[PDB]
Structures are given as C-alpha cells and as structure tokens.
Amino acid sequence: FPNSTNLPRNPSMADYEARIFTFGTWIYSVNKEQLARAGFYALGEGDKVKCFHCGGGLTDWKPSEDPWEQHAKWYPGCKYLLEQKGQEYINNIHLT
C-alpha cells in the first residue's frame, strides 16, 4: 500500500461515470466532479474516498482543497495520477 503498478486496484471503478455515481448523495463542499476526475469514488462513509487505481484513501477534506493535489501529495506512485497529471506535477508537489 499504496498500489504503484499499472493495474487498477478496483477495475469496477475505472470508469468516470461509475465513480461520479457514488457521489449522488455527496453533501461535502469538495467538488464531486473534481474528485471523480481525480480518480476517487465515495465509500459512503463520511467524506472518505479512494482512488480506483492506487487504492489510496483520503478523508477529512477541506472546502477549497484540490483533489489532484492531495492525490499527488499522498500517493505519488499512482499510475493513474501519472497518466493524467504527469511526472513534473507530482515531483513539484514534493519540491525540495
């Protein structure tokens, strides 16, 4: 943990539409579209979410937080993250 290979930890959540559906009753400020685009889906347990690829989990979100930024901060090895945001983006989140 987390998963840093090229195979998704949860294939059933690889589709954006599948992930966005999990946010049907989302009551938190952090944007659902942004979360789903960042690879996350809701567990239905508070504001807990997990990335379908690396399986990384995030909770206790702040109102203006950026999902992609938190994804890179805690799970830099995620391959979906790499594919979507690039290595420079990730490395910059962990700048000297």
């Binding site: 989990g57 937080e65 805690w74």
Partner: peptide, 4 residues
C-alpha cells in the same frame, strides 16, 4: 485531507 487526511489519508486512511
């Protein structure tokens, strides 16, 4: 955000 906090990881879990």
């Amino acid at each position: 955000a906090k990881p879990f």
